[PDB]
Amino acid sequence: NFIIPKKEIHTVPDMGKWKRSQAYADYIGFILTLNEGVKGKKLTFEYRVSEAIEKLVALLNTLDRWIDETPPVDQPSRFGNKAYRTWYAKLDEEAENLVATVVPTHLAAAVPEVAVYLKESVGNSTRIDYGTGHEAAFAAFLCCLCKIGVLRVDDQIAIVFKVFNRYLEVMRKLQKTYRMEPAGSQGVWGLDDFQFLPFIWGSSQLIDHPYLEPRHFVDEKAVNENHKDYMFLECILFITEMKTGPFAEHSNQLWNISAVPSWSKVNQGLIRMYKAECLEKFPVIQHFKFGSLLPIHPVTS
């Protein structure tokens, strides 16, 4: 009974049925389920790695590879490099074939439904840009795999620390390689040019840290010291690799968050901020796709 996920949020009044959709409930609970699973734990933690995780990292590694197979054009050019479209096209042809390496045959029919989210998670071919709208789809991608029991509860630490963490390395690579633009006003009032979720699961990691306080993440010296262990700081280091000038100028919203007393409170301030600035923002989220695994119909309870 699987189906090709389709667009359901066409107008601003549509945000209602979204916020009462099964999908919505499914999505956020999934978000918080993983958020809790990562509490106080270093990236170097000993977690369950399952063959499905291995096959996903391999899926992502193919994506990484195609970038190398598709070097940026040498044209003049001034925004996103147009070799991104050549990359994206390779994915559009090959998303199904790829999800197929992770999905058992008795669930063949789900491949098309599942692959859609995959195709929506890497940015925009026309505009060569990327934002939390696409990030969301990669989470929704992963949720679907839980919904069909390809991914397991036992794995929900390796989803963040291994798979999503690799996905982030691949996104950054696309962002450096093809000089991708932030999607819409991600680079105006945004927490970040590109991501959001890693700041959630990142600050969750640092809950109850002995030495490292939210106020410490603006200290670059200290960031270099600790990025290998923590998802939140890796994000920070990436910003400081991409932006001219002083922190408070280029990432003011994060700058103000560093003032927050505890990682616990940051993580509460972000869960909320993620709802408002992203999941409940028409412009960011209207492209979210709705099928059988994450449907639009009213929450059944």
Q: How many domains does the chain contain in total?
A: 2
Are 3 and 152 part of one and the same domain?
A: yes
Are 45 and 119 part of one and the same domain?
A: yes
Tokens (6 digits) for 161? 């620390």
Residue 56 identity: L
Q: What is the domain range of residue 52?
A: 1-190
Are 234 and 95 part of one and the same domain?
A: no
Are 157 and 196 part of one and the same domain?
A: no
Judge contact between 287 and 7, C-beta under 8 A: yes
CA atoms of 283 and 274, how far apart (whole Å) = 14
Are 202 and 180 part of one and the same domain?
A: no
Query: Would the annotation count 287 as a binding residue?
Result: yes
Query: Would the annotation count 44 as a binding residue?
Result: no
Query: Would the annotation count 286 as a binding residue?
Result: yes
* Cβ neighbours around 107 below 10 Å, total: 13
Please state how this structure was obtained.
X-ray
Closest CA to 290 of 134, 118, 117, 92: 117
Query: Which domain-ending residue is among 156, 190, 224?
Result: 190
CA atoms of 145 and 27, how far apart (whole Å) = 12
Are 180 and 201 part of one and the same domain?
A: no
CA atoms of 262 and 254, how far apart (whole Å) = 14
- Give me the residue label for tokens 């680079």: 187
CA atoms of 283 and 151, how far apart (whole Å) = 30
Residue 257 identity: I
Query: Would the annotation count 216 as a binding residue?
Result: no
Are 152 and 246 part of one and the same domain?
A: no
Query: Would the annotation count 245 as a binding residue?
Result: no
Query: Across-strand partners of 182?
Result: 130
Query: Would the annotation count 127 as a binding residue?
Result: yes
- Give me the residue label for tokens 């977690």: 47
